[PDB]
Design a protein around this ligand. Structure first.
Ligand SMILES: CCOC(=O)Nc1cc(-c2ccc(C)c(NS(C)(=O)=O)c2)nn2c(C)nnc12
Ligand SMILES: CCOC(=O)Nc1cc(-c2ccc(C)c(NS(C)(=O)=O)c2)nn2c(C)nnc12
Ligand SMILES: [Br-]
Ligand SMILES: [Br-]
Lengths: 125, 121
């Protein structure tokens, strides 16, 4: 018996029998949608984010956030050392690369955060 | 958002680091993506459909071209592509990183379109 079909990416049509100026533009828009890192935000309808949030919990084995680390420090039942804390902070960055890819704007943001923490920690001295 | 504890009675190296992580979480623009758990971000989806009158995506434009019952001209197609950028500014503001990304996309399309036509000639 047939299960309902999952959502996915647009299947590209090598050839189309519409107007040439529209067909050309289609091929161009497909490349943008498929290859350009900056298109990530605009590829799919916004309601497909639910689906992506679901895929995140399938892809990333150990999810992590700054909130989760801060709340765990306060609770006092998780972290005995600063190195333990930093392994979770590194994990945020590793998860981000894992899910978003190294070329993504989010990978760049993760890198900025890493060094912004280094700055703040060194300035705390 | 996490309520900051001015003083904590954990180890000094952990406590110092906590204060540092809080500043990152609270003040650093680049931390926005990593502040809260990913499942908290589903909330924004519903607000988007309240704010943006005519939502639009690249998927919607691509599927509509293929179907052949929407777009008669290239200018029609581009009005929907422009709409994606107008919606982005509307929802995120002009100064946002996402507004910059929308701008990069506009030009990335210009690049690809010109590389398509110059490739032919
Ligand atoms: C200031 C920070 O605000 C935001 O993060 N804003 C926005 C975020 C996203 C968004 C997130 C994640 C993903 C994976 C996608 N891609 S998808 C599944 O829709 O193809 C889109 N779309 N978006 C659109 C449209 N307009 N604004 C936003
Ligand atoms: C409709 C447009 O509104 C939004 O959905 N906006 C936002 C969306 C997301 C978001 C969702 C899903 C995913 C998978 C990701 N990527 S991540 C950070 O997990 O690597 C991001 N973050 N976000 C943050 C921060 N601030 N706003 C938003
Ligand atoms: Br988390
Ligand atoms: Br849409």
């Amino acid at each position: 018996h047939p299960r309902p079909l999952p959502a996915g990416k647009h299947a590209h049509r090598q050839s189309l029998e519409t107007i040439p100026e529209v067909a050309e533009l289609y091929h161009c828009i497909y490349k943008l949608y498929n290859e350009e890192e900056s298109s990530v935000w605009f590829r799919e309808p916004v309601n497909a984010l639910a689906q992506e949030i679901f895929t995140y919990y399938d892809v990333v084995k150990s999810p992590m956030s700054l909130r989760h680390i801060l709340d765990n420090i306060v609770k006092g039942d998780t972290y005995s050392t600063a190195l333990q804390v930093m392994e979770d902070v590194e994990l945020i960055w590793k998860n981000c690369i894992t899910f978003n890819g190294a070329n993504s704007l989010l990978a760049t943001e993760a890198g900025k955060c890493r060094s912004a923490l280094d700055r703040i920690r060194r300035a705390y001295q």
